[PDB]
Amino acid sequence: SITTEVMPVSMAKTSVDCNMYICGDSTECANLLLQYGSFCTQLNRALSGIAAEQDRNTREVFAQVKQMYKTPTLKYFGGFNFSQILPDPLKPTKRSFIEDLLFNKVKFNGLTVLPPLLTDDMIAAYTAALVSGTATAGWTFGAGAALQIPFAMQMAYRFNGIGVTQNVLYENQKQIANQFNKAISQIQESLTTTSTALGKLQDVVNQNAQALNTLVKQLSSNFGAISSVLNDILSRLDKCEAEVQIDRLITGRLQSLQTYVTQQLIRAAEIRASANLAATKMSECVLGQSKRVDFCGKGYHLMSFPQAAPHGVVFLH
Amino acid sequence: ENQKQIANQFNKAISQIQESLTTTSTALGKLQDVVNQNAQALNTLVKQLSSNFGAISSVLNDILSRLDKCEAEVQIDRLITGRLQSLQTYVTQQLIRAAEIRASANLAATKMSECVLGQSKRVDFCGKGYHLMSFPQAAPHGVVFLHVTYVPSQERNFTTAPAICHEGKAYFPREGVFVFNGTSWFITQRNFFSPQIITTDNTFVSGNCDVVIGIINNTVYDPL
Amino acid sequence: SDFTDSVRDPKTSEILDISPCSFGGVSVITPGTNASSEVAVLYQDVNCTDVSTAIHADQLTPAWRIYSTGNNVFQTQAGCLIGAEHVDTSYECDIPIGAGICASYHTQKSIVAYTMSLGADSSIAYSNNTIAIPTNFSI
Amino acid sequence: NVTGFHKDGIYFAATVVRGWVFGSTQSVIIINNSTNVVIFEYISDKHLREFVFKNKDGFLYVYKGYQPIDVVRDLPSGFNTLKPIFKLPLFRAILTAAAAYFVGYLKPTTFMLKYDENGTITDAVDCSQNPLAELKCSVKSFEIDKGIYQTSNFRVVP
Ligand SMILES: *[C@@H]1O[C@H](CO)[C@@H](O)[C@H](O)[C@H]1NC(C)=O
Ligand SMILES: *[C@@H]1O[C@H](CO)[C@@H](O)[C@H](O)[C@H]1NC(C)=O
Ligand SMILES: *[C@@H]1O[C@H](CO)[C@@H](O)[C@H](O)[C@H]1NC(C)=O
Ligand SMILES: *[C@@H]1O[C@H](CO)[C@@H](O)[C@H](O)[C@H]1NC(C)=O
Ligand SMILES: *[C@@H]1O[C@H](CO)[C@@H](O)[C@H](O)[C@H]1NC(C)=O
Ligand SMILES: *[C@@H]1O[C@H](CO)[C@@H](O)[C@H](O)[C@H]1NC(C)=O
Ligand SMILES: *[C@@H]1O[C@H](CO)[C@@H](O)[C@H](O)[C@H]1NC(C)=O
């Protein structure tokens, strides 16, 4: 029986211009913000470091093979049907069936969202090569050079690693193949019917969206000034009565931006911890067989196949 | 059988890693990054001390030497507020960075506890490939590991088979696989080619050769 | 967010939508000031036909006095680059840019941009009655 | 760009009796003799000499400099700085006596100056000349290793 296990890897990269968010196009507001000396370059440096950390997380998780392997022309390895895991050449997009059914399941403020270093096809190529290497080269292609093994003998070795002798596998291969195919069909149905199975990635996206939304909404408050729009202040007062109102806007918006930066730093730390856990899980569970109980799947562990996900990785142990 | 070759490989590996450590300048990235981050935080705090925060001057002694005790109070208040904000920001950044370093320290501690004092069967936790042992070394604000690994090379094609049967009884290998070689069959281990004659000592019997796919007809040597 | 977006015209009574015209972060990519002094400029998330027209009309507030190049313009999904030449050949990534593009400093030398390289490509042949056994090793 | 003769403050350099006038044309006169200086009748007591004039807050700053140069028709490229000489509380200039003077304009721009130990101004690179110059001005160092860096934001002026 196969089971799923979803983990986040990276969150949405973002950046905020300090001069555009706090002040408008008034150069005197730039002067008043330059009174609060050397403050808003720190925030931009922190968010640049966050974006670099997201790219590092994705690269450290997925790219763990020094060579890649062509997808085999046949998808039938001794009764084990692998058509639902490896990509098929018929579709113009080079993504598998599981990945295609799983991707579909989940300005005035200077806000920008930088694109990731690796696109979706990038990660899909990594995942397809990794799965094909698992299916063909066995458990020795990340621990040294690739050594081609037939699938039945690799299954016999993995059973021997569990504690069951090889004759048990070789006497009833067809029953095990039927159980494998039924398990894949069952997990496909369970993934395609329900709407709440990818909770964590949706939670990450919703948390980031809520943070951005509450920052943009908090921009619309007056902070005790006579009006909440800077251009209305500069079109109704001279250069000694508007200074105090400008100061109040600077202080309030500085507090809001600093709060958002701190929350982003803590959330990025949590995502980094999850990414390191997922990286060591795939390094000790796909490329090899783990004798640690209950680290990969419920019960004894044979192998595992990774799949891509929107800002994440989905395991099939 | 080949201790001297392994000793020569060990000595060449140590000399190679010594040369690679002494030639280049960018191999200890992380410790330099930690030192540079701390230096940047201290430098930007000291530089942020030099701003006036909207007061008439940025030096407190110049404020107290040019105003009385009711017009200097508001300027002193503005300096207090600004410097309080700067110090609180520095403390928060320091707390988060210390959390990251604590996570790295716990990971390094369990790595040395499960990799130097013992041999780890977790794949790709210590070094690339299989793991033999590891030697730690000190470093400025850090630890540097030297994992020694055993990796195979010079692969060779062979013809294999699941099992053989001699008189209606299937024979399965104990620890290893069957290799054809182009001659009579042999049994071997999965990481180093060292063939042996098929014998009832390293082979066990189960069932008949009628249900397992791909049985080969071959002889099994019994040691009499 | 209490932002003036649409305005009815006070005279002819028509409909005007208000947008903020193009702005964003700018970045510079360099091979380090030990090999050369030529850099390249990345403008983020702009369809930079607008940027080219506005810089030939001299209306950008980053005032590059002597810098004016329009012979090497390349378009990415992260923005567009001025100062790099597009090369179809794939290489291992030297400095990241975004959306699978990485700049480098290989060939006379200049800044070139290309598509991300997956790594060493290979293909291992499958047969269902063949095995591979190593015969040597290296500590 | 400088005008070879073989707004908000002007720059002066000349490779000889030298006089200045300032006004909107009663008269503001500056006369420099070989030995004596005569200037509100304030009375006081090859090579390239450089006078920098600036005007702000009702005050006018005069800066002077000196450097021995080579006899050549144009001006060689070199590096030197000039110290202030005086300041007063209150554009074309005429000189007479093979001679040349050059005028450049002043703009509000940012610099970044490198001092030294036992140090006058030793080297300086502009902050609004090249993108590499802006990068040097932002990282606040003379040596930048290979990488990508963010400097500022771009915007189109309406
Ligand atoms: C594997 O499953 C797919 C699911 O549609 C099916 O089309 C294909 O024929 C199967 N392969 C076999 C039965 O060899
Ligand atoms: C094994 O044989 C196949 C085809 O017979 C060949 O393509 C492959 O290169 C061989 N492997 C080695 C290591 O020579
Ligand atoms: C393996 O086959 C070779 C011929 O290629 C033969 O010389 C050798 O003796 C065989 N191995 C053993 C252990 O007999
Ligand atoms: C290997 O695959 C071929 C292709 O169908 C098949 O005919 C052969 O029986 C397989 N080998 C064994 C030992 O079953
Ligand atoms: C306002 O002035 C314009 C321009 O002359 C004219 O066309 C229009 O009829 C006037 N009245 C209104 C109600 O717009
Ligand atoms: C940029 O605008 C031009 C004209 O509007 C258009 O032809 C071009 O496709 C646009 N670029 C992109 C990337 O959409
Ligand atoms: C492994 O390779 C080395 C170098 O080619 C060689 O000297 C050594 O004999 C080889 N090992 C064996 C067991 O032949």
Author numbering:
A (entry chain B): 703 to 808, 836 to 1046
B (entry chain A): 900 to 1123
C (entry chain A): 556 to 662, 671 to 702
D (entry chain A): 65 to 70, 84 to 92, 97 to 106, 112 to 125, 161 to 166, 180 to 224, 231 to 237, 249 to 309
Task: Pull text from the paper.
Among structural proteins of Sarbecoviruses, spike (S) protein is responsible for receptor binding and mediates membrane fusion between cell and virus to initiate infection. RBDs in SARS-CoV-1 spikes were observed to be in the “up” and “down” positions making the spikes exhibit open and closed conformations, respectively. We introduced these three disulfide bonds in equivalent positions in the SARS-CoV-1 S sequence generating three spike variants: S/x1 (S370C and D967C), S/x2 (G400C and V969C), and S/x3 (D414C and V969C). We determined cryo-EM structures of SARS-CoV-1 S/x1, S/x2, and S/x3 spikes and we identified various previously undetected conformations for SARS-CoV-1 S through classification procedures.
By cryo-EM, only symmetrical S-trimers were observed for SARS-CoV-1 S/x2 and S/x3 spikes. The S/x2 spike adopts symmetrical locked-2 and closed conformations. The S/x2 spike can adopt a symmetrical closed conformation, spike protomer of this conformation has an empty lipid-binding pocket and disordered FPPR. Therefore, S/x2 closed protomer has almost identical features to the S/x1 closed protomer with a disordered FPPR (compare Figs 3E and S5A). Under native conditions, x2 disulfide is more resistant to reduction by DTT than x1 and x3 disulfides, likely reflecting different local chemical environments for different disulfides.
